[PDB]
């Protein structure tokens, strides 16, 4: 138990963490696995939570003692998976059973340093959905009875993982969209670390392969004379999604100049072009424009304006943008680059995915600490940006 | 079970139906409960009668005499729960089938709990019908939850006049449907959530006669197609300005995924060029406005599914292949630009 | 090994799989107003001639039923009428008269200690069929789908707004086939059977009526049979008009492109009006061929046969692609008195064809139009 | 109690009914008020069920003894209403109380020949919504204990009157749309009469005034040189609604010929015009067309086609239609007049509202008995109709 | 009560607020439960404080000191249920106010049942606040269910800096808003279900300068307006072919009822003609395509409502008047054609 204490006399944490060979997974947990703690991994079914936990477990079995409890898959099924992933000549125990009373008995017997519950939805107890909240409460008290690290898996369902977020020590989300081949592990709530930490992984035939240096993916993905491509750090609620805007500006041949968007609001693009013609001075009147959000990402947020203006200008001008620079900003009809919400989160996320510059609205920076790995350029007008970029 | 070390972990009854065996993960395990779900009329009784005649069948849904007429077209096959339990102890049957488990519906949950304990009392395989396997429309049987196998396994059948006939080569469905060198058809390995669906994109490019060039799609997003054509004209060099274009997703499949772009581009080009594509080659890839063929999700599943359905080539994005094992039965061609693809294809 | 009771109505017998099986529960479902009471009064006045009928219902009064049932049949025979509701008062009369056939005119209007409880009453009715070995008919107004799994035979009396046919189909039959149908037409007297339905399709058609064609489409699993209508006429004005009602506009637009590019019809300068007769929505790939044939029929000014129908998705290469549920569609066409049916040739692999209909497998649109015109 | 009886020996009804001064209300009940019976009056709130029952009650109090039970309005409120409506120097008893036990006691005391429950929703009992089904069951048994006629009121709500329809003797519906100034009382289920019977009433400042001779309303409503007006007997589910289609065909002055509909599907009208031009021979190519469903009635049923074709033709031709003739029929693209559902109900409803002709599809008439008060003309083609009409 | 013969059926506390008295059907009856409903912020506490200072106020929602500051701007006025009941027997107050009745919400139903029995124990008038009268947005107080009065009664108030000020002549709201002979404005007595709303239709007819004539509506159905103009051109004889038309429902009232046709026709004509309408005259009537002014529902209510809000004329359809008593304060003009109306109006 803990006691009310004066803040000046609150002593700094002196924990002993357990690191895994996966540098990324360690950063996320804020150094490594803290013993006597409850970590929830959330995400859509199929993303690879079981796969990530099997990989962590085969690594942790080398220094501690792992008990992997799954009601979801059978014991034989896991053996076929886990041999591809790692080495299991070590103290890694597997238990394909679902009732907590039958689990508790095995925790006292083998006394395992690390416990993994593959699918909390598939664990029962007296008194498969409501009763998840009561099982996780009993699991947090179980972390103190035996002083063990416990991992909980939460599949994110259509209706009835976000419920347990407030009552666990660490909350991780494993998310990886149809458009990206890569899956990201983010800390939403961390009691033993920072929440701005991220771990990038790519699922390959073996299992999850870490992506240290992601700046190389964006550079491989760009062609030689790329032009009309630009990058925006947008938001899907609170998740900062990083997206590519594409533009093909080409002179009209026919009567009417064509305008066609996919993934961006058409009218938003129409205004952007008016502001580029009237403020930036681009003769777009007689130019066709095709615009696309790469990936099929819907881009419906004011912050995407600057990236789309830069994309268009890049195609019009036939001058490429840098693939490690990105742009954030609402564009006003006077050419101004207006403020946007969550600027600190967007700059953080850009830096972590290996970006070197980020153009942001100048007003958004008032008293914000900037990460040393990325050049934050505050801009005020569209002319200023295009001058800087081209 | 008790917990067990992973260094210390490791037989079934097969039927003549190779497909049904794969789904159950090798064959029928003697001590479990298998649920077959699906819409009424699909053939869950028909499939279970066929498995049973190969391998105690209990039905309230149809009469005894009705089943005899069915099952002859399709040995020790024997045809409420208290009256059933008494016959399970007497005959001691290795396989038990309950044709329709269906306040009975509130009691259905309590009957299946008692059936799982019955599988342990007398070590028997028990099949339950629910109007975890799912039989849904060719016809497909897929494993949603499998304790003794993989969930990615699928069994393709076709209901005929006799009963359900298994399907080995589903490539021959598109090949019969292909006419004598018919242009503007192409194939994509798309996804309906996680199920990889294989679909045909169709294009009719023809010169405009009057005034404005027409563009009409059915099953594909119109604007997606519009951009594809701009990229084919500006990057690939096809003069499509004065050409009408009609596009169709064969089957009435909705194709709303970035991966379909390349197949649509190839379809259009094929019709424009009047040069056909191969019916055993398929295409997967998002097409960028620079002509690039961008990466797509679930590439390993798509290549797997193409190979299994008897395809010989598959054009994929080149970047997607990093450290992925390729099946020996299919030629995976990684491409980077649309020009590269059309050069290879035509 | 069974002894059934036939009625004078050939159709109603086929549906039950030969006739009325004694000691059985038959549920007749449908909307209110279709004629379940009327059909059961007609069967009862016929069955009273060989057995003993007890007609129970509280939905209508005794005096009301007498006025109805004299128009329908003869009532000098052992036909007993009982306008009561609660069960216990019914059971007492079943033991007394010992009737071979029992009819309950609305299960919704019967009580035992009146919808939830309906499930418990029908359970007690099925055990009543064993105690006395009698055939019992139950009526279920559709507001019926709850009792379908716990009765011996399930019949549905259905009638879409466009056809004045009233079709009786067996959804679940323990003593017969489920494919069986009984076609009736409600007239001023009551329900008149339609034994030759082939003659009805051959009144709805005019003399020189081009641009009409028939498709066997599907409303889920029910195969609906529908008429596609086309009016192709040369444009007078600048732009050629295209207007659909009941079909997807873009689907029709592609069909016309395929007819011009593959079949060779000069439709560029022709206006086209298309309609699904009845206000049936036709949103299924299978309707393509019928719409193509309709248009061609109007363009060509050559009529189609009214007893021929067409099923098939039309590819942009002119091909006639496969469609789902082909065996059900052929079966439904045959039963409504059709003589030909054009289907996709690939759909026929190992399917047994009914002897009453000519199934023509086709592969291209050119082939079809050649055959048709 | 009643007994199983052979149909040949079932004797004809020999009842004694009570008539009211309102000829229409009597017809609906099939002659008059049957004693020892349960009659349900349904309809939207505000239509005038209380008003109709107060009028019936003040008339029935002259020959029997009425007990009007209302939980909905107070006793004093009803007195102010009922003096405008009729005479109450007679045995008319008012009881503003809601519990059935307290009601039962007063039924045994005064022994009233007629009982009215103003709002069954506002009557309570042990064991305001579920329990309506149990109260009406107890009311049907109460009709046999004392042999009295009982009227039940059912307000038709958004969600939770149509529930009691199967367990009462007579079901009446009082309906009267925003477009008609008149309210109609129809028998949906009648154990002591025909269901095709109808009673037309018009709510005036005093209360409900009966409309005997409705043929005069349609004739007053038409102007002198009316043209382009026609009448259709459409259906709103099962209720046959009678509606007026309006057309204004006038030559185009400008470039494009205008087409504008309100209440009819535009495309349906477009096809109708094509069939009139191609089959009937009307030169509508260079004519503007404005079409309106009078009342704001949505007309979305195939049967409305013929009425719209006749409306247009009437305006084009500048020849009026008869205001006591109406038209029913789907129009095929070959000019044919196709069959429609519920033809017998439509012909009935037309006749009852004082129509003299009705053009129907010829095929729809096979073995249907036609009412003697209306001329049913079966037609086969649009040309045939326009020939007959003009 | 016991049943009683109708030949044998037949006083209240009034407040200075004439409107509030009408709503309760004369005044406050001493032995009943009155519920005031509405959205938070509307002024149910403010209205009850004003009635109370004119006529025991119980509030958990606001403190005693807070109410004193409010109620002075706006005598024997005194400021859980067991602690309340004890004070009801002591002071014996003629009027009790519960400011906010608000598992309390499950118990709310049980508290109000005990409050209705409390009205009989001590014959007192009790007001209940629910975050049957409804206070909704000028501001209106309407009686939904009244046991001691009519439900068609309404009380109009306007919240000002002091508190709620009653409104006598709501005609003066449109009259202040009317400029010096402003054309193209007209008034309709429309209906929002059963509530007769009174609304202003606005039109700007102006000659087209280029190519196509514009038509733009806000609050009225576009097509309805389009037909009205065709009828004004073909029947009334207004050359609107080459005129642009902008139409607006003032307030953002949706006007989707046939009765609004005549007001819109008169509005357009007024703008076309550049002749104003009277601001105390209003118009009700569906307009047929022959120029006829057809009947409308609820005519008696509409005429009543117009008169009460200080209107002097009302143009109604002539057929609608058959056997209806007309109020002496308003000139009801029955019309039959649109030409007749425009002749009378201009
Ligand atoms: C480890 C591994 C998994 N898989 C498949 C099997 C799994 O069911 C699927 C999804 O991974 P999984 O980790 O089970 O997803 P979840 O996030 O729902 O726990 O990936 C392979 O195909 N190959 C492999 O080597
Ligand atoms: C076996 C068989 C079935 N059928 C028909 C009868 C069945 O009602 C229908 C559907 O098959 P069934 O297996 O009964 O469907 P389910 O159990 O999924 O509801 O197929 C045939 O026509 N011929 C056959 O040979
Ligand atoms: C027998 C008969 C019925 N009818 C009417 C009376 C019935 O109430 C109506 C509808 O038939 P009914 O069989 O009662 O419909 P269901 O029982 O399916 O709801 O048909 C006639 O008009 N004439 C007749 O000769
Ligand atoms: C009798 C009468 C009613 N009314 C009003 C008061 C009623 O609340 C209203 C509606 O009639 P009512 O009969 O109460 O409608 P419901 O169908 O809901 O029972 O008509 C008058 O204005 N004047 C009258 O003379
Ligand atoms: C009486 C009064 C209220 N108010 C404000 C304070 C209240 O919070 C607000 C709303 O009135 P109130 O009657 O409290 O709203 P309700 O009871 O309907 O929720 O009006 C003033 O600003 N000045 C005043 O003189
Ligand atoms: Mg998993
Ligand atoms: Mg079955
Ligand atoms: Mg009936
Ligand atoms: Mg009332
Ligand atoms: Mg308040």
Q: Within 10 A of B212 (CB to CB), how many other CB atoms are there? A: 10
Q: Quick one: which of A181, A176, A308, A281 has its CA closest to B289?
A: A308
Q: Tell me how far the alpha carbon of residue D363 lies from the centroid of ligand 3, in angstroms.
A: 21
Beta-carbon neighbour count of residue D114 at 10 Å? 24
Residue D6 forms contact with C (CB below 8 Å):
yes
Contact with chain B for residue C285, Cβ under 8 A: yes
Breaks (C-N over 2.5 A) in chain A follow: 127, 160
Structural tokens at position A265: 């609001």
C-alpha to C-alpha distance for A223 and B340, rounded to whole angstroms: 13
User: How many A from CA of C41 to the centre of ligand 9?
Assistant: 40
Chain C positions in Cβ-Cβ contact with residue D369 (cut-off 8 Å) = 188
Interface test with C, best of D332, D369, D378 (most C CBs within 10 A): D332
Going from the Cα of E194 to the center of ligand 10, the distance in angstroms, rounded, reads: 28
Give per-residue burial for E177-212: e unless 16+ CB within 10 Å, then b: eeeeeebbbbbbbbbeeeebebbbbbbebeeeeeee
Q: Do C244 and D238 touch (CB under 8 A)?
A: no
Q: Which of B291, B279, B343 is nearest to B317 (CA)?
A: B291
Burial string for E320-344 (b: 16+ CB within 10 Å, else e) reads: bbeeeebeeebebbbbbbbebbbee
Q: Collapsing DSSP states into helix, strand and coil, what is residue D261?
A: strand
Please judge whether D367 and C189 are an interchain contact, meaning their C-beta atoms are less than 8 angstroms apart: yes
Burial B125-141 (b: 16+ CB within 10 A, else e): bbbbbbebbbbeeebbb
Instruction: Please indicate whether, in this complex, the C-beta atoms of E286 and D292 are within 8 angstroms of each other.
Output: no
3-state SS of C286-323?
Answer: HHHHHHHHHHHHHHHCCCCCCCEEECCEECCCCEEECC
Which residues on chain C are in Cβ contact (under 8 Å) with D270? 243, 273
Closest atom, ligand 3, to C-alpha of C36: 18
CA of B130 to the centre of ligand 7 (A): 9
- Pair D176, D184: CB distance under 8 Å: yes
Report DSSP state, residue E236. I
Q: Is D285 exposed, middle or buried (0-12, 13-18, 19+ CB in 10 A)?
A: exposed
D8/C62 Cα distance (integer angstroms): 11
Alpha carbons C86 and A387: distance in angstroms, whole number: 90
Instruction: Kindly state the tokens that stand for E106.
Output: 């499950």
The 3-class SS string of chain A reads CCCCCCHHHCCCCCCCCECCCCHHHHHHCCCCECCCEEEEEEECCCCCHHHHHHHHHHHHCCCCCEEEEECCCCHHHHHHHHHHHCCCCCCEEEECCCEHHHHHHHHHHHCCCEEEEECHHHCECCCCCCCHHHHHHHHHHHHHHCCCEEEEEEECCCCCCCCCCCCCCEEEEEECCCCCCEEEEEEEEECCCCCCCEEEEEECCCCEEECCCCHHHHHHHCCCCCCCEEEEEEEECCEEEEEEEEEEEEECCCCCCCEEEECECHHHHHHHHHHHHHHHCCCCCCEEEEEEECCCCCECCHHHHHHHHHHHHHHHHCCCCCCCEEECCEECCCCEEECCCCHHHHHHHHHHCCCCEEEEEHHHHCCCCCCCCCEEEEECEHHHHHHHHC
Q: What share of chain C is helix, strand, coil (3-state, %, to 5)?
A: 30, 30, 40
d(Cα A93, Cα C129) in Å, to the nearest integer?
60
Expt. technique: X-ray
Kindly report the number of other CB atoms within 10 A of residue D372's CB atom: 7
**Interface size between A and B, measured as CB pairs under 8 A:** 121
Tell me if C317 and B183 make a contact (CB, 8 A cut-off): yes
**Facing residues of A210 across strands?**
A201
Residues A97, B1: C-beta atoms closer than 8 Å: yes
What's the rounded Cα separation, in Å, for the pair C361 and C345? 4
| Residues in chain A within 8 Å Cβ distance of B295 | 181, 221
Contacts of D221 in chain E (CB under 8 A): 294-295, 319
Nearest CA to ligand 2 atom 14: B45
Instruction: List phi, psi (to 5°) of B40.
Output: -65, 140
Q: What angle do CA C337, C343, C344 make, to 5 degrees?
A: 170
Closest-CA distance of chain A to residue B327, Å: 12
User: Which residues partner with A360 through β-bridges?
Assistant: A378
Is residue D51 within 6 Å of ligand 4 at its C-beta?
Answer: yes
Q: How far apart are CA A81 and CA A382, in angstroms?
A: 53
Q: What are phi and psi of D239, to 5 degrees?
A: -70, 125
- Distance set, CA B203 to CA A65, B225, D194 (Å): 60, 11, 62
Do the two chains E and A touch, given a threshold of 8 Å on CB pairs and at least 3 pairs? no
What's the count of helices (H) and strands (E) in chain C, helices before strands?
A: 10, 18
Helix%, strand%, coil% for chain B, nearest 5: 35, 25, 40
D47 touches chain E (CB under 8 A): no
Q: How far is CA A296 from CA A95, A248, B186, B257, B260, in A?
A: 41, 17, 22, 7, 12
Whole-number Å distance between alpha carbons of D71 and D37 = 22
Q: How far apart are CA D60 and CA D67, in angstroms?
A: 10
Measure the CA–CA gap between D63 and C84, rounded to whole angstroms. 32
Six token digits for residue A181: 């081949």
**Interface D:E, Cβ pairs < 8 A:** 121
Please tell me the distance from the alpha carbon of residue D37 to that of residue D191, in angstroms, as a whole number.
Answer: 9
Reading phi first (left if > 0) and then psi (alpha if -120 to 50, else beta), residue A267 is in alpha
Q: CA nearest D204: which of E319, E153, E286?
A: E319
């Amino acid at each position: 138990k803990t006691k009310p204490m004066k803040l000046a006399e609150v002593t700094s944490i002196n924990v002993n963490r357990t690191k895994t060979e996966m540098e990324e997974f360690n950063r996320v947990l804020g150094g490594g696995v803290v013993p006597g703690s409850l970590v929830l991994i959330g995400g859509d079914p199929g993303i690879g939570k079981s796969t990530l936990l099997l990989q962590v477990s085969t690594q942790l079995s080398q220094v501690g003692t792992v008990l992997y409890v799954s009601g979801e898959e059978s014991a034989q099924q896991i053996k076929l998976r886990a041999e591809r992933l790692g080495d299991i000549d070590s103290e890694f125990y597997l238990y394909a059973e679902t009732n907590m009373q039958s689990v508790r008995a095995e925790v006292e017997r083998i006394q395992p340093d690390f416990l993994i519950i593959d699918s909390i939805q598939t664990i029962m107890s007296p008194e498969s959905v409501s009763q998840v909240r009561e099982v996780t409460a009993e699991l947090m008290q179980l972390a103190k009875t035996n002083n063990i690290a416990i991992f909980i898996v939460g599949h994110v369902t259509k209706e009835g993982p976000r419920m347990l977020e407030h009552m666990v020590d660490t909350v991780l989300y494993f998310e990886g969209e149809r458009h990206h081949t890569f899956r990201i592990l983010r800390a939403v709530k961390n009691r033993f670390g920072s929440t701005n930490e991220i771990g990038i992984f790519e699922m390959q035939s073996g299992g999850l392969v870490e992506v240290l240096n992601p700046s190389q993916v964006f550079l491989e993905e760009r062609l030689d004379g790329a032009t009309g491509s630009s990058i925006v750090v947008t938001m899907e609620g609170t998740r900062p999604i990083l997206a590519e805007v594409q533009a093909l500006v080409t002179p009209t041949m026919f009567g009417n100049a064509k305008r066609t968007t996919t993934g961006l609001d058409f009218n938003r693009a129409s205004l952007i072009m008016a502001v580029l013609e009237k403020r930036a001075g681009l003769l777009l009147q007689n130019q066709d424009a095709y615009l696309k959000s790469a990936g099929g990402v819907k881009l419906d947020e004011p912050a995407i304006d600057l990236a789309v203006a830069v994309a268009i200008a890049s195609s019009y001008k036939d001058k490429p943008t840098n693939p490690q620079e990105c742009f954030v900003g609402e564009l006003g009809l006077t050419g101004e680059i207006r403020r946007v919400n969550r600027i600190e989160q967007r700059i953080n996320e850009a830096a972590k995915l290996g970006f070197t510059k980020i153009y942001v609205p100048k007003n958004s920076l008032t008293g914000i600490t900037l990460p040393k790995e990325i050049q934050v350029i505050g801009v005020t007008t569209i002319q200023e940006v295009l001058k800087k970029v081209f």
